[model samples]
Target: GSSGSSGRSSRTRFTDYQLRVLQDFFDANAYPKDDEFEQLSNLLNLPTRVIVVWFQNARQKARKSGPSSG
Candidate 1:
């Protein structure tokens, strides 16, 4: 069996405001510290690990999407 792009995984879903906040932070800083992750967790009402994983995925996506100017 081939693993095609057809699967509904249990990925975390974010709200509009939550996404806005995450995007804002990502734009400013792709990597965050433990305290920062904790802050995001409290602000977004999500688990710190989830926020960390989200950032990790976002960084990977950004890297795959294009080459950075600098």
Candidate 2:
């Protein structure tokens, strides 16, 4: 359950490096279950919610932007 302030800000955007890192992360742990986020956060040196939010935003972006041939 996210609070009002927990929603993403308009300024949120991933750099190319960050996206690559996140892609690697997802590739390594594609099917993580509960409590996996904590391990991922520690492994990536990121906050748990940051990873969660990034995944959420990435999914939305994929749905809205659709697939690219490249």
Candidate 3:
């Protein structure tokens, strides 16, 4: 059974540490800038690409989840 996406798997999900790293990055930076990503990656000891991918996925999820209209 193929999930369609090349690099993604059905069971693939972010770990707690990974999620925290992403949250930290988002808190410190407005946009997912390359330099900010690099710094976060270095601080978290995670791959820069992973941070980029996480941010991308997180952004998509956030958008899809929608905002709360006051």
- List the candidate numbers ranked by lDDT, top first: 1, 3, 2
* Model 2: ten consecutive residues of lowest lDDT: 57-66
Candidate topping TM-score: 1
Off by over 4 Å in 1: 1-8, 64-70
What value does the lDDT take at residue 18 in candidate 2?
64
lDDT of 1 by residue, 1-70 (tens): 9779775464879998999998899999988899888888898889987788778889987874456566
For model 2 the TM-score comes to 0.51
Overall lDDT per candidate, in order of appearance? 0.84, 0.67, 0.70
Question: Which runs in model 2 stand beyond 4 Å of their true positions?
Answer: 1-7, 10-18, 27-31, 64-70
TM-score of each: 0.73, 0.51, 0.62
Model 2: lDDT of residue 29: 60
Say which candidate scores most in lDDT: 1
**Model 3 TM-score (2 dp):** 0.62
**Weakest lDDT window of 10 consecutive positions for candidate 3:** 5-14
